[PDB]
């Protein structure tokens, strides 16, 4: 129960993404890995750039 709140809190911290984008596959796979982090002092910007480059890797037509 607490893990879902961590996932959602990190989702709002990354960009304030809407749940509609939370359902996206790149998000659906990476939100659990971003859960096992960001509890550390790491950053908020790093996660935005990571989502950027991963979303980019995903969309190679």
């Amino acid at each position: 129960k607490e893990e879902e709140k961590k996932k959602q809190q990190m989702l709002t911290g990354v960009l304030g993404l809407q749940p509609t984008m939370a359902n996206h596959p790149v998000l659906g796979v990476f939100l659990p890995k971003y859960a096992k982090q960001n509890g550390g002092n790491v950053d908020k910007t790093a996660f935005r750039l990571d989502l950027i480059r991963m979303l980019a890797l995903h969309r190679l037509n």
Binding site: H24, T45, L49, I52, R53, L55, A56, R59, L60
Partner: protein, 144 residues
């Protein structure tokens, strides 16, 4: 870097650009983080793979004017798939621009004559770029 490519890089930046520029270049520094987070990430690039593929661009001043500066007219959306192309490209991004020092002693035949403690100093612009023209749009993001 191969030995050949390294040597040709030294040749290029030490002979060809200064001789053909007459010393009219400048080293540059870039915040890649603020550059990407201002160029995009807002509207079209977080569209969940349905609005993205047929999306009209955000059409900001910050990026559509750059693409109009590379091309006048001839474009309906003004970003006719080129924002898609660039966003697909930018998985291969890098660090911010750093300075590096290089303390190196000379060849031993010049190290000899009371030059053992000499330590040549080289500043080398890590992950930056040469620059030749006065930047106006991205003055927030490019340090000379």
């Amino acid at each position: 870097p191969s030995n050949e490519n390294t040597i040709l890089s030294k040749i290029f930046y030490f002979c060809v650009l200064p001789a053909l520029s007459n010393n009219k270049a400048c080293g540059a520094g870039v915040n890649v983080k603020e550059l990407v987070l201002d160029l995009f990430y807002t509207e079209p690039f977080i569209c969940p793979d349905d609005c993205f593929q047929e999306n009209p661009i955000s059409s900001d001043v910050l990026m559509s004017l750059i693409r109009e500066a590379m091309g006048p007219g001839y474009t309906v959306a003004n970003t006719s798939s080129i924002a898609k192309q660039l966003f697909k490209s930018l998985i291969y991004i890098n660090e911010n621009t750093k300075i590096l020092e290089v303390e190196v002693s000379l060849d031993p035949a010049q190290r000899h004559g009371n030059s053992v403690h000499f330590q040549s100093l080289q500043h080398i612009l890590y992950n930056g770029l040469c620059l030749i023209s006065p930047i106006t749009t991205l003055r927030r993001y490019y340090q000379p």
